[PDB]
C-alpha cells in the first residue's frame, strides 16, 4: 500500500482530532447563533478617521476607539436604504453569522450596534489591503506561496462547512493579508446556513460553479470549485475561465475543459482537475472522504495543517508595514442620525 503502519496511524489520529475540534467548534457556534450579541458599543465611543468606501446602502469608515486607540473598519448601513433595496434578510444574516463564527482566518466582528438611522458593524482592521492588488502587482504567486494561502482557505472551508455554512464569494478581492502574512476572509454577505441544497444565483462570474450557472440546485461543493479557481488564479496570475462578457465565461465554465500554463506542476494540474470538476460525483470535497481528498493530495504533501492553523509557519510575504492610521480616496459625508427611529421593527434582531 501507499502507507506503512506508522504513517497510517498518524493520519488516522490526525483525522480523529479534526473531528473533536469540529464538534467543539459547532457547540460554540450554535450557542452564539441561537443567542446573538447585540448592542455592544455605541457611535460616540469612536472617532471617525476616513471613509474607505461606499455602496448602495452603506459605507466603510476607518475609526479609532476613543479610549483604547484601536483602529477598526466600521460598516455603516442606512436602514431606510437597506429596506428600499430589499436587503433586510441579507444584512441581518451577515451580522448574525459574523458574531457567531470564530476562526483565525476570518475577519472578526468586534462590536455592533444600531441607532435611529443606521446599523453599525465594527470590524477588525487589516491595513495591508487585499490579495487582489498584491497578486496583480506581483503578477503570480509561486506554487509554495499559493499553497500557503490555499491551505488557509481549505481549513476555513472545513470549519465553515462543518457549521452548514456555504460561503459563496471566494475571490482574491475578498481576501486580506494581515501583518503576519496570513489570510483574513471578509464579506459574508452571500454566506448561507443551510444543510441541503439552495438555489440563489449569486457569486462572481469567474468563480461560479457550473451547477450555479445551470440553474440546478447546489450545495457546499460550489466553494470547493471556487477554491480551484482561486488556486489557478494565484498560480497563473489570471483565472481559468475568462472572456469579455459573463455569458462567454459561463460557456467555458460548463464546457468541462480547462487549460494550464506550462509552468504548473503535474501535482497542481491534478489537484485543479479534481476541484474544477463539472461532475459532482467526482469533485474533490464532495466525495466519501470529504475534505481529506484535498488535504491528502500530493500538492499539499509539504503542508503541516496544524502548524498553519497555529500560525507557526513563516509567511512567504509580509505586506509593507505602515501604521493603522496610514491608509483609494473617497469623499467624506456626515453620519446623520435622525431624532425619530426608522425601520425599528425590521431590524429588531440586529
Amino acid at each position: 500500500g501507499h502507507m506503512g503502519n506508522a504513517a497510517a496511524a498518524k493520519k488516522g489520529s490526525e483525522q480523529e482530532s479534526v473531528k473533536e475540534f469540529l464538534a467543539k467548534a459547532k457547540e460554540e457556534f450554535l450557542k452564539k447563533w441561537e443567542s446573538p450579541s447585540q448592542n455592544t458599543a455605541q457611535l460616540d465611543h469612536f472617532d471617525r478617521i476616513k471613509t474607505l468606501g461606499t455602496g448602495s446602502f452603506g459605507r466603510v469608515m476607518l475609526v479609532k476607539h476613543k479610549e483604547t486607540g484601536n483602529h477598526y473598519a466600521m460598516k455603516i448601513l442606512d436602514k431606510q436604504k437597506v429596506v428600499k433595496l430589499k436587503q433586510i434578510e441579507h444584512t441581518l444574516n451577515e451580522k448574525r453569522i459574523l458574531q457567531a463564527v470564530n476562526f483565525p482566518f476570518l475577519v472578526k466582528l468586534e462590536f455592533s450596534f444600531k441607532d435611529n438611522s443606521n446599523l453599525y458593524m465594527v470590524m477588525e482592521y487589516v491595513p495591508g489591503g487585499e490579495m487582489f492588488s498584491h497578486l496583480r502587482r506581483i503578477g503570480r504567486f509561486s506554487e509554495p506561496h499559493a499553497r500557503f494561502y490555499a491551505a488557509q482557505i481549505v481549513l476555513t472551508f472545513e470549519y465553515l462547512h462543518s457549521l452548514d455554512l456555504i460561503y459563496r464569494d471566494l475571490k482574491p478581492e475578498n481576501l486580506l493579508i494581515d501583518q503576519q502574512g496570513y489570510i483574513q476572509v471578509t464579506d459574508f454577505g452571500f454566506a448561507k446556513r443551510v444543510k441541503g441544497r439552495t438555489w440563489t444565483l449569486c457569486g462572481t462570474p469567474e468563480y461560479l460553479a457550473p451547477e450555479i450557472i445551470l440553474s440546478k440546485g447546489y450545495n457546499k461543493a460550489v466553494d470547493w470549485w471556487a477554491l480551484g479557481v482561486l488556486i489557478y488564479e494565484m498560480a497563473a496570475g489570471y483565472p481559468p475561465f475568462f472572456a469579455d462578457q459573463p455569458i462567454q465565461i459561463y460557456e467555458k465554465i460548463v464546457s468541462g475543459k480547462v487549460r494550464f500554463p506550462s509552468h504548473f506542476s503535474s501535482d497542481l494540474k491534478d489537484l485543479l482537475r479534481n476541484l474544477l470538476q463539472v461532475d459532482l460525483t467526482k469533485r474533490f470535497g464532495n466525495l466519501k472522504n470529504g475534505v481529506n481528498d484535498i488535504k491528502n493530495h500530493k500538492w499539499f504533501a509539504t503542508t503541516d495543517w496544524i502548524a498553519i492553523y497555529q500560525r507557526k509557519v513563516e509567511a512567504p510575504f509580509i505586506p509593507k508595514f505602515k501604521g493603522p492610521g496610514d491608509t483609494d480616496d473617497y469623499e467624506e459625508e456626515e453620519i446623520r442620525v435622525s431624532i425619530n427611529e426608522k425601520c425599528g421593527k425590521e431590524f429588531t434582531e440586529f
Partner: peptide
Amino acid sequence: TTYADFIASGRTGSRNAI
C-alpha cells in the same frame, strides 16, 4: 497568448458580484 487575452478581456480589475 493567454495573458494577452486576459488583458484584452477588460476583466483584469476588481470584479463585482452578480
